[PDB]
């Protein structure tokens, strides 16, 4: 799983 924001 992965989650990234900007």
Question: d(Cα 1, Cα 3) in Å, to the nearest integer?
Answer: 7
Burial status of residue 6 (CB atoms within 10 A of its CB: 0-12, 13-18, 19 or more): exposed
Cβ within 8 Å of residue 6, ≥6 positions away: none
Q: What would the 3-class secondary structure string for the chain be?
A: CCCCCC
- Report how this structure was experimentally obtained: X-ray
1 burial via Cβ count (<10 Å: 0-12, 13-18, 19+): exposed
What resolution, expressed in A, was reported for this entry?
1.1
4 CB-near residues (< 8 Å, 6+ apart): none
How many CA atoms lie within 13 Å of 2's alpha carbon, on the beta-carbon side? Answer: 2
């Amino acid at each position: 799983g992965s989650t990234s924001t900007a």
